[PDB]
Design a protein around this ligand. Structure first.
Ligand code: HEC
Ligand code: HEC
Ligand SMILES: [Zn+2]
Ligand SMILES: [Zn+2]
Lengths: 136, 136
């Protein structure tokens, strides 16, 4: 019933990126520069298919340093992970939600079976609980 | 003698990202959110191996918009492209330099054989004229 650590996600397709600066509603704990990655199965859902079991999306969050009006990536803060399994994760709309502190497999962040994550993602039910959209 | 448009570069490994904001010395013309991509041959050279002819690095530059203490990706401004051919691009350190406006294959930007690009990259001779470093 645990989300698997998504080994090798850095080699996956880069969906998009966004900077969340101090003052943003999501600052705690998602402040920083994040990159969204999708495995092959998740790309099927992002393209307008149904997300297959085994789809994984990763929210890869870095600290940044503002230096002379450049925002420069610092250390990895955490990753967020969504793992599709319609049966195993039925209580949170078919996605398992986990966080890994500093992107380390032994630093699991979710302590409520992913209900809090799901509570916010639920608004995106019509896009299968996923915020990020494919871009060129 | 022309640098090839790097078709399918959006499927390549994402090396790193950076934001260049107003008041930074590179704001014209590199202001925005940029993502660096590397093909297989470029990964060999980055990882600390040497760069094979055929290595390609892409600088993918987006305008961004301010949205309530987030910086959100906007339209693509341009791509920069370095293609390795030690013999063909010998006049610019063995990399061919090209810009494509809005990332469109039909909007080539470089008019001086890439000597302007190379002038800045020459400072990075000890890393084979590449600024970007691999990160986790
Ligand atoms: C200094 C005034 C520069 C000039 C002129 C050009 N580039 Fe460059 N480039 C510069 C920097 C500081 C960086 C690193 C950005 C980062 O995120 O660390 C880059 C990077 C590239 C890359 C990616 C590979 C690398 O060397 O890191 C490419 C593909 C690239 N630049 C291409 C490019 C082209 C085609 C230029 C002339 C049109 C050009 N650059 C000029 C700094 C400078
Ligand atoms: C209060 C709102 C909110 C909460 C709580 C939340 N997120 Fe999300 N999450 C977002 C938003 C907004 C995005 C889209 C970011 C973007 O567009 O770059 C996002 C994106 C993601 C993504 C990339 C896929 C997508 O849907 O775009 C993953 C993976 C993710 N979140 C995981 C988590 C996990 C794991 C938790 C709990 C540990 C969680 N999130 C909590 C708002 C939330
Ligand atoms: Zn405010
Ligand atoms: Zn600033």
């Amino acid at each position: 019933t645990k989300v698997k650590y998504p080994d090798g996600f850095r080699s996956w397709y880069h969906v998009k990126s966004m900077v969340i600066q101090p003052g943003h509603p999501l600052e705690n704990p998602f402040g920083g520069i994040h990159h969204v990655y999708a495995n092959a199965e998740a790309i099927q859902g992002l393209r307008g298919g149904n997300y297959p079991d085994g789809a994984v999306l990763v929210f890869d969050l870095f600290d940044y340093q503002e230096d002379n009006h450049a925002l420069v990536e610092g250390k990895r803060k955490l990753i967020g992970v969504m793992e599709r399994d319609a049966k195993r994760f039925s209580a949170t709309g078919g996605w398992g939600y986990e966080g890994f502190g500093e992107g380390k497999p032994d630093k699991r962040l979710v302590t409520d079976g992913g209900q809090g994550c799901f509570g916010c993602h639920a608004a995106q039910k019509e896009s299968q609980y996923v915020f990020s959209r494919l871009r060129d």
